[PDB]
């Protein structure tokens, strides 16, 4: 393939975050969250896959 | 029995504590905890029991 942020890209609009603890009867719970997009191919052709090697 | 700190003893590693209040709607819940061990008999030759009555 040909690497270029013009044919394919991955985006992470929000990074890893940790919210404050939420106490319960003698224990806690700490949630976590983040966002992501995934790989999007813009000019589906600049990629060649060889199968069975 | 004979009362002496080197013959028997009760121990309280952690005293009585009140945890911070946990709100829930228009009321609150407050938990309380403490620790204890019991009676330990270091020298058992200084105690005599009359059981039966």
């Amino acid at each position: 393939y040909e690497k270029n942020p013009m044919n394919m890209s991955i985006e992470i609009p929000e990074a890893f975050n940790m919210l404050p603890a939420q106490p319960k009867d003698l224990h806690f719970k700490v949630p976590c969250t983040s966002k992501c997009t995934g790989l999007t191919i813009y000019r589906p052709m600049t990629i060649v896959l060889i199968t069975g090697v």
Side-chain angles (χ1 to χ4, degrees), chain A:
Chain A
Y1 69 101
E2 152 197 284
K3 230 204 110 109
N4 214 88
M6 212 75 58
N7 316 354
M8 52 202 89
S9 87
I10 309 180
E11 289 183 18
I12 307 174
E14 156 171 345
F16 184 65
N17 325 309
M18 257 169 46
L19 319 184
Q22 306 182 358
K24 210 170 181 183
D25 304 339
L26 272 71
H27 78 259
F28 302 84
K29 173 222 313 168
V30 189
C32 309
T33 169
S34 90
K35 305 221 291 183
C36 92
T37 278
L39 179 83
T40 40
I41 314 184
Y42 293 177
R43 356 279 311 108
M45 232 167 25
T46 50
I47 303 190
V48 169
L49 176 96
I50 311 172
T51 309
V53 317

Short mmCIF file of all heavy atoms in Angstrom, two decimals, chain A residues 34-53:
data_model
loop_
_atom_site.label_atom_id
_atom_site.label_comp_id
_atom_site.label_asym_id
_atom_site.label_seq_id
_atom_site.Cartn_x
_atom_site.Cartn_y
_atom_site.Cartn_z
N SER A 34 -13.56 6.48 26.72
CA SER A 34 -12.77 7.05 25.64
C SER A 34 -13.55 6.90 24.35
O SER A 34 -14.58 6.22 24.31
CB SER A 34 -11.40 6.38 25.52
OG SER A 34 -11.45 5.27 24.63
N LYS A 35 -13.06 7.53 23.28
CA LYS A 35 -13.69 7.46 21.97
C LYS A 35 -12.66 7.09 20.91
O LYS A 35 -11.45 7.26 21.09
CB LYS A 35 -14.37 8.79 21.61
CG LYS A 35 -15.37 9.27 22.64
CD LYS A 35 -16.61 9.85 21.98
CE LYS A 35 -16.30 11.15 21.27
NZ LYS A 35 -17.53 11.74 20.68
N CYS A 36 -13.16 6.58 19.79
CA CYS A 36 -12.34 6.15 18.66
C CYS A 36 -13.22 6.14 17.42
O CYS A 36 -14.45 6.24 17.51
CB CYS A 36 -11.71 4.78 18.93
SG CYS A 36 -12.68 3.39 18.33
N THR A 37 -12.59 6.02 16.25
CA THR A 37 -13.33 6.04 14.99
C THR A 37 -13.16 4.73 14.21
O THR A 37 -14.14 4.12 13.79
CB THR A 37 -12.88 7.22 14.13
OG1 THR A 37 -13.55 8.41 14.56
CG2 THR A 37 -13.18 6.98 12.66
N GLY A 38 -11.92 4.30 14.03
CA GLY A 38 -11.60 3.16 13.19
C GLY A 38 -11.00 3.60 11.87
O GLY A 38 -10.97 4.78 11.52
N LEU A 39 -10.51 2.61 11.13
CA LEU A 39 -9.83 2.87 9.87
C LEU A 39 -10.85 3.11 8.77
O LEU A 39 -11.75 2.29 8.55
CB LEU A 39 -8.92 1.70 9.49
CG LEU A 39 -8.19 1.89 8.15
CD1 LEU A 39 -6.94 2.72 8.33
CD2 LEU A 39 -7.86 0.56 7.51
N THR A 40 -10.71 4.23 8.07
CA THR A 40 -11.55 4.57 6.93
C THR A 40 -10.66 4.70 5.70
O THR A 40 -9.67 5.45 5.72
CB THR A 40 -12.31 5.87 7.17
OG1 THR A 40 -11.46 6.81 7.84
CG2 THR A 40 -13.54 5.62 8.03
N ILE A 41 -11.01 3.99 4.64
CA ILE A 41 -10.24 4.01 3.40
C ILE A 41 -10.91 4.97 2.43
O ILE A 41 -12.10 4.82 2.12
CB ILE A 41 -10.13 2.60 2.79
CG1 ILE A 41 -9.74 1.59 3.87
CG2 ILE A 41 -9.10 2.59 1.67
CD1 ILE A 41 -9.51 0.20 3.35
N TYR A 42 -10.16 5.96 1.96
CA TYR A 42 -10.72 7.03 1.15
C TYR A 42 -10.58 6.79 -0.34
O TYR A 42 -11.48 7.16 -1.11
CB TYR A 42 -10.06 8.37 1.50
CG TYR A 42 -10.35 8.89 2.90
CD1 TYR A 42 -9.76 10.05 3.35
CD2 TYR A 42 -11.21 8.21 3.75
CE1 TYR A 42 -10.02 10.53 4.62
CE2 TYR A 42 -11.47 8.69 5.02
CZ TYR A 42 -10.88 9.85 5.45
OH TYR A 42 -11.13 10.32 6.71
N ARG A 43 -9.48 6.18 -0.75
CA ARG A 43 -9.29 5.85 -2.15
C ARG A 43 -9.07 4.35 -2.24
O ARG A 43 -7.96 3.91 -2.54
CB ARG A 43 -8.11 6.61 -2.75
CG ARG A 43 -7.47 7.61 -1.80
CD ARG A 43 -8.24 8.92 -1.74
NE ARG A 43 -8.53 9.44 -3.07
CZ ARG A 43 -9.74 9.44 -3.62
NH1 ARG A 43 -10.78 8.95 -2.96
NH2 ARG A 43 -9.92 9.94 -4.84
N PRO A 44 -10.12 3.56 -1.95
CA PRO A 44 -9.98 2.10 -1.95
C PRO A 44 -9.37 1.57 -3.24
O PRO A 44 -10.11 1.19 -4.14
CB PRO A 44 -11.43 1.62 -1.82
CG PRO A 44 -12.13 2.74 -1.12
CD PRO A 44 -11.49 3.98 -1.67
N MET A 45 -8.05 1.55 -3.32
CA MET A 45 -7.36 1.08 -4.51
C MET A 45 -5.87 1.10 -4.24
O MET A 45 -5.12 0.29 -4.78
CB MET A 45 -7.69 1.95 -5.72
CG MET A 45 -8.19 1.17 -6.92
SD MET A 45 -8.92 2.23 -8.19
CE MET A 45 -8.10 3.79 -7.84
N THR A 46 -5.44 2.04 -3.40
CA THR A 46 -4.03 2.12 -3.05
C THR A 46 -3.62 1.02 -2.09
O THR A 46 -2.55 1.11 -1.48
CB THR A 46 -3.71 3.49 -2.45
OG1 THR A 46 -4.65 3.79 -1.41
CG2 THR A 46 -3.79 4.57 -3.51
N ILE A 47 -4.44 -0.02 -1.93
CA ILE A 47 -4.13 -1.14 -1.05
C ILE A 47 -4.27 -2.44 -1.82
O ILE A 47 -5.27 -2.68 -2.50
CB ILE A 47 -5.04 -1.15 0.20
CG1 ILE A 47 -4.92 0.16 0.97
CG2 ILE A 47 -4.70 -2.33 1.10
CD1 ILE A 47 -5.58 0.13 2.33
N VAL A 48 -3.24 -3.28 -1.72
CA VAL A 48 -3.24 -4.59 -2.37
C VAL A 48 -2.93 -5.64 -1.31
O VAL A 48 -1.93 -5.53 -0.59
CB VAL A 48 -2.22 -4.67 -3.52
CG1 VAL A 48 -2.06 -6.10 -3.99
CG2 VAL A 48 -2.66 -3.77 -4.67
N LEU A 49 -3.78 -6.65 -1.21
CA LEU A 49 -3.62 -7.73 -0.25
C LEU A 49 -3.32 -9.03 -0.99
O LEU A 49 -4.03 -9.38 -1.94
CB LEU A 49 -4.87 -7.89 0.62
CG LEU A 49 -4.86 -9.05 1.61
CD1 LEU A 49 -4.42 -8.59 2.98
CD2 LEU A 49 -6.22 -9.72 1.67
N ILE A 50 -2.28 -9.73 -0.56
CA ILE A 50 -1.91 -11.02 -1.12
C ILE A 50 -2.32 -12.09 -0.12
O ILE A 50 -1.87 -12.09 1.03
CB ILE A 50 -0.40 -11.10 -1.42
CG1 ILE A 50 0.04 -9.86 -2.21
CG2 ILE A 50 -0.08 -12.36 -2.19
CD1 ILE A 50 1.53 -9.76 -2.39
N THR A 51 -3.20 -13.00 -0.54
CA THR A 51 -3.79 -13.98 0.36
C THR A 51 -3.21 -15.36 0.08
O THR A 51 -3.09 -15.77 -1.08
CB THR A 51 -5.31 -14.02 0.18
OG1 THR A 51 -5.84 -12.70 0.29
CG2 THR A 51 -5.95 -14.90 1.25
N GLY A 52 -2.85 -16.07 1.15
CA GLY A 52 -2.39 -17.45 1.07
C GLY A 52 -0.89 -17.63 1.17
O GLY A 52 -0.40 -18.75 0.97
N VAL A 53 -0.14 -16.57 1.46
CA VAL A 53 1.31 -16.67 1.57
C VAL A 53 1.70 -17.54 2.75
O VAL A 53 2.06 -18.71 2.59
CB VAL A 53 1.96 -15.29 1.68
CG1 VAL A 53 1.32 -14.32 0.71
CG2 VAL A 53 1.87 -14.77 3.10
#
